[PDB]
Amino acid sequence: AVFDKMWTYMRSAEPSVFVRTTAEGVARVRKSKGKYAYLLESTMNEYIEQ
Amino acid sequence: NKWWYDKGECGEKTSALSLSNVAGVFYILVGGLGLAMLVALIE
Amino acid sequence: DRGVQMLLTTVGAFAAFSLMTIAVGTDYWLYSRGVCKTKEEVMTHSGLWRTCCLEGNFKGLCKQIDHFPDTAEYFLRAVRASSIFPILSVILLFMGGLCIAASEFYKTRHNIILSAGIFFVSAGLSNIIGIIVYISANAGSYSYGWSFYFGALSFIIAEMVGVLAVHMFIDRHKQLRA
Ligand SMILES: CCCCCCCCCCCCCCCC(=O)O
């Protein structure tokens, strides 16, 4: 349920939630004050956090 | 459910208190000042 | 001293009247972000009567604010439309000026100075009611312009001059009883 709902939202989102690269995704989640979240691999997420 | 809700496009901090929801007490205050002036002048 | 007090009262009265008259005729009350001309949102002047535009494709254009695009709301809408209270403030300040002018001539009456005091105080009260009505009418970002603060400064000066007039009348009756 939960993940499918998130998928449906992301496909049905305007402007574009998706990104073309990890670097731009991190840059965007930084750009939005708290208005963006990024779903990515745990290891990469921890590394970016550090 | 799927086509009415699963495709559903749909499902704050307290604000400072504005001059509009204490305006009445200001009106009463100025009215009372006017009334007081009138009474003093009558006396 | 009596001479200095009278001069200061007269100057204050003139300053208050000038300030309020400028404020009630000028347009820089509310730096909101509205529409210069309709029937693209940009900065505006939005005075008491005409909402000139600014910083848009076309500047300087002014149109009379659309008053009246709930009887409780209807009465407030009507009172803001006429701006009776700002205008009544101006009138009362003018009448107080007339009283102070008649002070020097046809003097020894002692009750026209009291009249000036009462008119100035009443002008201040009218001004404060007007400010509240205006600010309430616009609750349906922004900033306030120099004409609004001209109105505010008018209120403070009017109250000071009223205090001066009342104190001066008291001094006159104190001298008379001695
Ligand atoms: C009992 C006397 C107290 C007097 C207090 C005086 C304080 C004055 C401070 C003025 C701040 C104005 C801020 C401007 C805001 C705006 O309109 O953008």
Swiss-Prot record, chain A:
What tissues contain this protein? Detected in forebrain. Detected in dendrites of neuronal cells. Expressed in the pyramidal cell layers of CA1 and CA3 and in the granule cell layer of the dentate gyrus.
Identify the domain of life: Eukaryota
Induction info reads: Down-regulated in the pyramidal cell layer of CA1 in the hippocampus by global ischemia.
Cellular localization per UniProt: Cell membrane; Postsynaptic cell membrane; Postsynaptic density membrane
Q: How is it modified after translation?
A: Palmitoylated. Depalmitoylated upon L-glutamate stimulation. Ubiquitinated by RNF167, leading to its degradation.
Positions of L-glutamate binding: E41
Query: Which residues are annotated as modified residue Phosphoserine in the UniProt record?
Result: S32
Task: Describe its function.
Answer: Ionotropic glutamate receptor that functions as a ligand-gated cation channel, gated by L-glutamate and glutamatergic agonists such as alpha-amino-3-hydroxy-5-methyl-4-isoxazolepropionic acid (AMPA), quisqualic acid, and kainic acid. L-glutamate acts as an excitatory neurotransmitter at many synapses in the central nervous system and plays an important role in fast excitatory synaptic transmission.
Q: What is known of its domains?
A: The M4 transmembrane segment mediates tetramerization and is required for cell surface expression.
Subunit structure as annotated in this protein's UniProt entry: Homotetramer or heterotetramer of pore-forming glutamate receptor subunits. Tetramers may be formed by the dimerization of dimers. May interact with MPP4. Forms a ternary complex with GRIP1 and CSPG4. Interacts with ATAD1 in an ATP-dependent manner. ATAD1-catalyzed ATP hydrolysis disrupts binding to ATAD1 and to GRIP1 and leads to AMPAR complex disassembly. Interacts with GRIP2. Interacts with GRIP1. Interacts with NSF via its C-terminus. Interacts with CACNG2, PICK1 and GRIP2. Interacts with GRIA1 and SYNDIG1. Part of a complex containing GRIA2, NSF and NAPA and/or NAPB.
Miscellaneous field? The postsynaptic actions of L-glutamate are mediated by a variety of receptors that are named according to their selective agonists. This receptor binds AMPA (quisqualate) > L-glutamate > kainate.
Q: Which family does it belong to?
A: Belongs to the glutamate-gated ion channel (TC 1.A.10.1) family. GRIA2 subfamily.
* Protein name as annotated: Glutamate receptor 2
Origin organism is Rattus norvegicus (Rat)
Gene that encodes the chain: Gria2
Measured against the full-length protein, the chain present covers: 686 to 735 of 883
Curated annotation (Swiss-Prot), chain C:
- Subcellular location field: Membrane; Synapse, Synaptosome
GO biological process entries: eye blink reflex; membrane depolarization; membrane hyperpolarization; nervous system process; neuromuscular junction development; neurotransmitter receptor localization to postsynaptic specialization membrane; positive regulation of protein localization to basolateral plasma membrane; positive regulation of synaptic transmission, glutamatergic
Quaternary form? The L-type calcium channel is composed of five subunits: alpha-1, alpha-2/delta, beta and gamma. Interacts with the PDZ domains of DLG4/PSD-95 and DLG1/SAP97. May interact with GOPC. Acts as an auxiliary subunit for AMPA-selective glutamate receptors (AMPARs). Found in a complex with GRIA1, GRIA2, GRIA3, GRIA4, CNIH2, CNIH3, CACNG3, CACNG4, CACNG5, CACNG7 and CACNG8. Interacts with GRIA1 and GRIA2. Interacts with MPP2.
Say what the protein does.
Regulates the trafficking and gating properties of AMPA-selective glutamate receptors (AMPARs). Promotes their targeting to the cell membrane and synapses and modulates their gating properties by slowing their rates of activation, deactivation and desensitization. Does not show subunit-specific AMPA receptor regulation and regulates all AMPAR subunits. Thought to stabilize the calcium channel in an inactivated (closed) state.
Gene Ontology terms, cellular component aspect? AMPA glutamate receptor complex; cell surface; cerebellar mossy fiber; glutamatergic synapse; hippocampal mossy fiber to CA3 synapse; postsynaptic density membrane; Schaffer collateral - CA1 synapse; somatodendritic compartment
Q: Which residues of the full protein are shown?
A: 5 to 210 of 323
Q: Does the keyword Transcription regulation apply?
A: no
UniProt KW keywords: Calcium, Calcium channel, Calcium transport, Glycoprotein, Ion channel, Ion transport, Membrane, Phosphoprotein, Synapse, Synaptosome, Transmembrane, Transmembrane helix, Transport, Voltage-gated channel
- Organism in which the protein naturally occurs: Rattus norvegicus
Which protein family is it in?
Answer: Belongs to the PMP-22/EMP/MP20 family. CACNG subfamily.
**Protein's name according to its UniProt entry:** Voltage-dependent calcium channel gamma-2 subunit
What GO terms are given for molecular function?
Answer: calcium channel regulator activity; channel regulator activity; ionotropic glutamate receptor binding; voltage-gated calcium channel activity
Q: Give me the segments passing through the membrane.
A: 6-26, 82-102, 112-132, 150-170
User: What is the membrane topology noted in the UniProt record heading this document?
Assistant: Multi-pass membrane protein
